[PDB]
Write an enzyme that holds these catalytic residues in place. Sequence first.
Site, PDB file in Angstrom:
ATOM      1  N   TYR A   6     -15.629  14.615 -16.657  1.00 15.30           N
ATOM      2  CA  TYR A   6     -16.264  13.206 -16.721  1.00 15.30           C
ATOM      3  C   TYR A   6     -17.238  12.967 -15.573  1.00 15.30           C
ATOM      4  O   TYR A   6     -17.133  13.495 -14.509  1.00 15.30           O
ATOM      5  CB  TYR A   6     -15.035  12.386 -16.451  1.00 15.30           C
TER       6      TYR A   6
ATOM      7  N   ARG B 221       0.865  -1.250  -0.084  1.00 21.66           N
ATOM      8  CA  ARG B 221       0.108  -0.080   0.095  1.00 21.66           C
ATOM      9  C   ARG B 221       0.879   1.243  -0.095  1.00 21.66           C
ATOM     10  O   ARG B 221       0.493   2.322  -0.755  1.00 21.66           O
ATOM     11  CB  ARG B 221      -1.112  -0.236   1.257  1.00 21.66           C
TER      12      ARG B 221
ATOM     13  N   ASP C 152      -6.524  16.699 -16.164  1.00 20.96           N
ATOM     14  CA  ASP C 152      -6.867  15.295 -16.423  1.00 20.96           C
ATOM     15  C   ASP C 152      -6.454  14.941 -17.749  1.00 20.96           C
ATOM     16  O   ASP C 152      -7.139  15.164 -18.720  1.00 20.96           O
ATOM     17  CB  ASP C 152      -8.256  15.032 -16.003  1.00 20.96           C
TER      18      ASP C 152
END
Lengths: 400, 400, 400, 400
Positions: free
Chosen positions: B116, B63, B189
Site C-alpha cells: 500500500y 489512550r 497486513d
Amino acid sequence: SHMDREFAKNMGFSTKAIHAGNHKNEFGTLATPIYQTATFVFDSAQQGGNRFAGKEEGYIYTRLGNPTVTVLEEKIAILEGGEACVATSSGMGAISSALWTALKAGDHVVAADTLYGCTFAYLSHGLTRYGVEVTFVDASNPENIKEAMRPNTKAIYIETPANPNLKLIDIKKVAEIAHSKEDCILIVDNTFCTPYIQRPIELGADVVVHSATKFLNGHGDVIAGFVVGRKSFIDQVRLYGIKDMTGACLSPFDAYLILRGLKTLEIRMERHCSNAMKVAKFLEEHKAVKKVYYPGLESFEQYELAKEQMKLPGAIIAFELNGGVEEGIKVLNSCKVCTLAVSLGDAETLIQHPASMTHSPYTREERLKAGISDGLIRLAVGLENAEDIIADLKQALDAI
Amino acid sequence: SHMDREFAKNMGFSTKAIHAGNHKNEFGTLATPIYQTATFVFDSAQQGGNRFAGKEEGYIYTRLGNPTVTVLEEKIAILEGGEACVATSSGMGAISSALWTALKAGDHVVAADTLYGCTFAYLSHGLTRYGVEVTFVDASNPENIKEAMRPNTKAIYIETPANPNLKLIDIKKVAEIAHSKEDCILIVDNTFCTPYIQRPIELGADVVVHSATKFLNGHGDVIAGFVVGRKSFIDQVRLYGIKDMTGACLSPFDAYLILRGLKTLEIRMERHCSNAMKVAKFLEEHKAVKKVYYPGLESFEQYELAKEQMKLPGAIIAFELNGGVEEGIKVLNSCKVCTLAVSLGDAETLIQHPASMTHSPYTREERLKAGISDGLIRLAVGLENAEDIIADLKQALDAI
Amino acid sequence: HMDREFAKNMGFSTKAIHAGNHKNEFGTLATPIYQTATFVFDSAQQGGNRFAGKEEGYIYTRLGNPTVTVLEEKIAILEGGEACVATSSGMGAISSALWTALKAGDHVVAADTLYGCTFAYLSHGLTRYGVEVTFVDASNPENIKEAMRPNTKAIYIETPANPNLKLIDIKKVAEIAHSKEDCILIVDNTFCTPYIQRPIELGADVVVHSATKFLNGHGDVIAGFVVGRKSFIDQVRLYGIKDMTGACLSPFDAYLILRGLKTLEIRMERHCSNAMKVAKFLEEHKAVKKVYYPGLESFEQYELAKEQMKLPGAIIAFELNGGVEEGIKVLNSCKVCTLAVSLGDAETLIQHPASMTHSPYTREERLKAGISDGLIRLAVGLENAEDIIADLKQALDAII
Amino acid sequence: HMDREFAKNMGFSTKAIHAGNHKNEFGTLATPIYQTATFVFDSAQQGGNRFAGKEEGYIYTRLGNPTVTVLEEKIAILEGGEACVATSSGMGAISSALWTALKAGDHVVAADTLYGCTFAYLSHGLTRYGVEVTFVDASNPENIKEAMRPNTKAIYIETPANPNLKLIDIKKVAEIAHSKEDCILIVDNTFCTPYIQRPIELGADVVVHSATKFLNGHGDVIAGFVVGRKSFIDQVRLYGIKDMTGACLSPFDAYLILRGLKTLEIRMERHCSNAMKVAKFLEEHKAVKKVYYPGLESFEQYELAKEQMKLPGAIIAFELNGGVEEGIKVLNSCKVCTLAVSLGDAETLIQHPASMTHSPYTREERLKAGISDGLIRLAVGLENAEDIIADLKQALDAII
Ligand SMILES: CCCC[C@H](N)C(=O)O
Ligand SMILES: CCCC[C@H](N)C(=O)O
Ligand SMILES: CCCC[C@H](N)C(=O)O
Ligand SMILES: CCCC[C@H](N)C(=O)O
C-alpha cells in the site's frame, strides 16, 4: 469559511471561539456538520489526480483531511495566531508527529527537565533508540539551554507551566536562543494555558502543541491534539508525520465535540482560574499544607514572569503537605467532591499523586532532579462553586 | 466478557462476530455502551498506583485503554486466532505502532515490493531516515526473501493480496523463513481478506495488522486499525508504540461503529465475494478488457494458492483495458452506479486509477517494477445487486 | 454517586456537574452513552418482575435508559421536583403532559401569549378532541380566576413569554389552581432554566422545558423535560410517551444535554451579563423605539422580575422607529448576530417576526396576534458584549 | 445523486445504498450527520419565504433536517410511496398519523391482534378523546366490513401479528376501506420491511414502521416512519409531529438507520434463511407442540404468505408440550439465544410472554388476550443457524 481572519482580528476571544473558522454550508446549519466519512467522491478522474498532486483544493480521505476537522484547525490557528493547524487523535500524537517530521537520525534536541511523563518517555526511551541525542536541562534559567546547544541541535522542546510543579520558562528568551542557529525550532506545549492565557507563537515560538483532551475540549470525553505553526511545516506534519509516521488522525465526531467545547472556552477558563486563585489562597493559609505552587499567589517564585506571559494564572495547583505520602493518601481518599482521577481541564475537579500516577515513567532519581516530591499533590480545579471545593478540601485536610 | 473464548471455539464466524468479546454490564444493555470518556475514577489512591504498576486490573485513561475498545480488541483477537489485539485511530497507526515497537536503529527489514502506497512511504522514506535499512523484494517467490535476509533482520513485512494488482504470498513458507533466525517476526497486513477469509496467525505469522476502515467496519465512516499477536508484544505496542511513539489511540465512538459493522461481517464478505466473482467473469469475457486479475478466476496465476490460504477470493478486482490511461478515464467518468472514489470495503462499489491515486507516492520507476500499469483500474466491489454493477460497467466499457 | 440529601447544601454549578451521576463498574468520569434499544434479563423471572414493577431495572429505551435516568435525576434535583422524564422535543414534553393530565370533557385556562406551536396544539389540537380551552391575559391573575370552570383540570402558563416578554406571578396562579380539588398548574420554564426560576418551589405542580434552548446550550439537540410529582411523572412516562406521543429521547442526545449542563451556571451568567449590556445600549440608541427586558428599570413588571427570577434572562424584544422594511435592513446588515430562529445558544440569534415567522400572516392578522412592524426578538449569545453591541450599532445607525 | 426515475429499474440492495442520497459540496460518501437544532437564513426575506412554503430550505430540526430527509426519501422509494416522515419511535409514527387523520366523533376499525402499546393507545387513548374503536378478527375480512360505520375514517391493521403470527389480506381490506369516501387503511409493516411486503402497492394509503426493529437492524435506535401520499405526510409533519406528539427523530439516530439500511437486503435474506431452518427443526422436535411460521406448510395462511410476502420473515411463535414452568426452564437454559424483548437484531432474541411480558396479567386475563402457558416468541438473528438450533436443542431436550 464565513468569518474571515481579517474580520476576526478586531473581534474578542469568545466571539472568535464561536464564529472564526466556521463554514457556511449549502443547508446553512448553525452547528458544524459531523462529516463522519472515510472517503470522498471526485467529480472526474482528472480531479482526483489533481487533488493528489496538490494542484486543486478538495478532500480525498479523512486521514489526509476532513471538513469538520478543517473548521477546528482554522479556529485553533486563529486563536493561537499561527498560519496553520493540524489535529491529531491524542496530545501525544501531536507531540510525536511534529518531532518525527522535524527530526532525523543524527539530530540533537534540548528538552526541558520537567515535562509530562509520556513526553519524557518518548524523548528518553524513543527518540534516543532511533539515533537522536536528547539533552535535558533546567529550563527555568535560559543559560542552561544555551550551554546544551550543539551544531546539530535542530529543535528545543519546552512546556510552561511544567506538569506538575508548575515551573515557568520565558518563551521570548528561549526563542532568541533557538533562532541564533540557522536550522533550529522551538516547540512549546501550551496545554495548561490554552490560547486564551498564553500564545507562544506571538512571543517567538515556531511550533505550538496541545493536548485538546484537557482545557480546549473541557468536558473530558475526547482524546485529541493539535500542532500549530507555519503552513510549510504543518503541511509536512499532515502529509508525513500523521499520514505515514504515526497515523494519529482525529475522528470527525471527536473534532465536533472539541468545536462544541470551544464555544465556552473563555467562560470556562475564567471560572477555572477564578476558583483556582480562591483554592490556592485557602491552601496557603491552611495549617496542614507546607508549600503551595500557583502562578497567582505572591509567594510564587516566578510571579513577575506569570504576569508578563500569562493572561490568567491557570487552573492547576501543585502543593506539598506537612506529612509524607501516607498523609497525601488520607487527603485523596477523604475527598467527596474532588474526584480521585488522572487528567486535567474538566468541569469535575480532579486530584492525583504525580509520583505514583502521572510522572510514574520517571525513575525516582530523574523525578527528584526535576522537582517531584514524594507527597506532592496536583489539583486540576474544575468549574464547581469554589465554596464547595474549599469545603471538601478543608474536611479532608483537617483530619491530618 | 460473557461468552468465553473456550465456548466460542465451537461457534461459527457470524456467531462469534456478534457474541464473542461482549461484556455483560450492570444494566444489561444488548449493545456495547459507548464509554465516551477521557479519564476513569479510582476507588482509592492505592488502587491508582497499583493500576499504573500493572498490579491490579482496571482503567486509567482512554489512550491506555477503554471498555468499548476492549470488547472490540477481544472480538478481533478471537476471530484472528491471536492471544491479544490493540486498536488504533487508523490502519497506518497500527502499521507504524507495531514497527516502531519491534524495531530500533541498526535493525534491518525485508518488505514486499508491492505494498500500500503509504506503507511503502513509511518504510522507504520513514524508517530509513531513522537508521533502519529496508530491502524490498518480489515476495511471490519466497527465495528472494531468503536471499535478502541478514543477521540484523528483525522483521519481515508482507501484504497478501498485494494492493492493487492482487499478487499473493504463501504465508506458511515465509513464516518458516522468518523463524529460521532467532530474533525475527512476520507481520502480515490482512486488510483485504479479514479473519473470515484468511487467518495468518494460524498459518505461521507472529503479528497481523488491519485497516479496520475497509471491510471490518464495512460502512466507510471510521478510520481505524488493529495489531493482533502474542500478549507480550501487544502489551509493548499498547504501552510504548501507541502510548508514546505514535499516539494513535482509537476513539470509543469509532470503536462502537466497528463493533456495529462486525455484526454483519460474514454476510457482507459473502455478498462482496459473490458479486466480485460475477463482475470478474463479466470483465474477463468483455472485449474492451485486456487482462483481469482476481483470485477466483481460473486465469489467475496463483489460483491454487488462493484456494489453499483464502476461504473466498475477496472483493477487489484489478484489471487492464485494451487502451491507455485516456480509455481508463473515459470508463471512470461514464460510471453512474460505481462511485469514483478512493478506499475499499464499503456497501458502495468504489473505483479508482492506482497510478495517479493510491500508489501515487511510488515513483514511476518503483511503480512499474512492482507491477502497476499506466491504465490499471482497481475495483472495490460493494454490496449492490451484481446485475446493476455489471450493467453500469457494461455501458461504460461499450463506449470505448 | 451524589445523593439528593448531600446535594441539598451544594451550589448550582456543583449540582449540575455531580448530582444524578452514577458510579459505574468501570468508573468512567463521563456518563456512558448507553446507545441501545433493548436490555437483557438474567432470567425469565427477572423480565417478568421488571414488567410487574416489583424489581428495579431496564426493559426498553422508549420506557427508560441509564443515560436518560442520570439526566432526569439531575434536572429534577435542580428544579426541586420529585421526578423528571425526558422527551425528544420541547413540544413532546408539553403534549405528553397535557395528553396524560386531560381527557374529553375537561377545560384548560391557557395564557394568551404562548409559543407558536403550543398555541396551535391547544387551539387546533386539544379543541379537535373535545377539550375546551380559554385563552386569557395572564399578567392580571384575576382573568384566570374568571375563566375558571367546574371542569378546569389544568392551567398552562409561560413566563416570560413572547412578543413583549410579559411575566406571570406563579405563586398567585398556583393559589387559583389549588382552590379547586382537581386542577394543576403547568409552567413552561424554557427561558429561565432552574438557575433563574424554579416554579415548583413557588407553587407549580408540573414544569415543562424545551431542553433545545438553554439547558443544552449548544443548539444541536431537540429535547424536552416534564418535572413534577413521581405519581404524575410515572403516568407521563408509561402513557403519555409510551403510548400517546412516542416522544422518547435518544441516549446520544441525552448525553449532549448532560455535557451542556456542566456549564449551565457559567453560560446563564454570561448570557444575562451580555443581555443587560445590550438592552441598556438599545434603550439609549435613537433608532430603537422601545425595549422589553426584565433587567431595565423601564420594564413594567420590574418588581416581579426581581421577586421570582435570579437574573433577567438572555432574551430581548425591541421595537424600532420604523416599519417592516427598516427591520429587514437591520437584520440583513448584521455580520455577528446570526439570522436564525431558536434561543439559548453560544451564537447570538436575531429574528424579525413581521418579515420572517409571521410572514404568511397579513398585517391585520399580525397585529391581532401581537406582532408589530418593527418588533425584533434577540436571543443574546455568549460572544463578547462589545462585539454584539458594535454589530447592532452599525446595523441600527444605517436606519437613522 | 440518484433520481427516483433512475432507481425504478435498480434492485433493492442498490436502492437501499444509493437512492435518496444527496451529493453535497464536499462529496462525502457517507451522509453527513447534520446534528443541529436551527438553520441560518442568508436574508430576512429567505426566512419568511421558507415559513410561507414558497422557497425550499430548512428552518428547525423538529420541522426537518437534511440527514432525516435522505432517510425519508430512501424509505419512501423502497415502500413505493410518495413521501415519508421519520419519528423518534415506532409509537411516535403510529400516534402522529392517527392524531392527524382523526378527530372527536370519528370511528376506527382496528385488528384484534396488535402490538401491546398500539392496543393501549387505541383502547385507552383514543377512546378517552371521543373516538370510538371496534376491534375485530381481521383474518376474515368480512368482520371489518360488518364493523364499518358512516363515521369510520380509518382501518388499522398489522400483518403478521402476535401471538400466533396471523396474516391479513391487504388488497381485500383496501377494497373495504375505499368503499366509503373518507376512509384510509394504515398498515404496520414493521415485521416485513419493504423488502418482503409493500402495502402501498397492494392498496394501503398509509404504512407505519418501527425502525427500531429490522430497518435499523442493530438494536441501538428507537425510531419510526409514516409513509403515504405527500398531502397526508405534510399534515403529519406540520401537525402530528410538530404540535400533537413532538416525536421528531434525532439526526444521529437517523444516520445509524441509514447505516443499517446499507445491509437490509443481506440481513433480511439471512434472517429468513435461519428462521426457515429453526422453524423446521422446532416442528420436528418432540418437546414442541405447535409452530407458527409463514414458511412452514403447516401454517394456516400459507397461500396468502406466498401471495403478499417475498420471504416468510424472521419471527417464530411456538407452543411447548408444557406449562409456564417448562417455558421458564427453556429460556433460562439458553446460552446463545438472548433473553430480551424487541426484534430485528443480529442477536437472536427469545421471549416467553406468560412469564415475562404478560406476567402482571392473571392466567384468566392471559388466555383472553391470547397468551398460552407455553407460548414463546423467537426473533431469529443473524448468527449461524447451526448454533441457534444447537442452543435450542440442548434447552428443549431438558424438558422432554
Ligand atoms: C498516563 C496518562 C494520564 C496522564 C494525564 N494526561 C495527565 O497529565 O494528568
Ligand atoms: C491515500 C489515502 C487513500 C488510500 C486508500 N486507503 C486505499 O487504499 O484505497
Ligand atoms: C417551528 C418554529 C420555531 C421557532 C423557534 N423555536 C423559536 O423559539 O422562535
Ligand atoms: C414496551 C414493550 C416492548 C415490547 C417489544 N417492543 C416487543 O417487540 O416485544
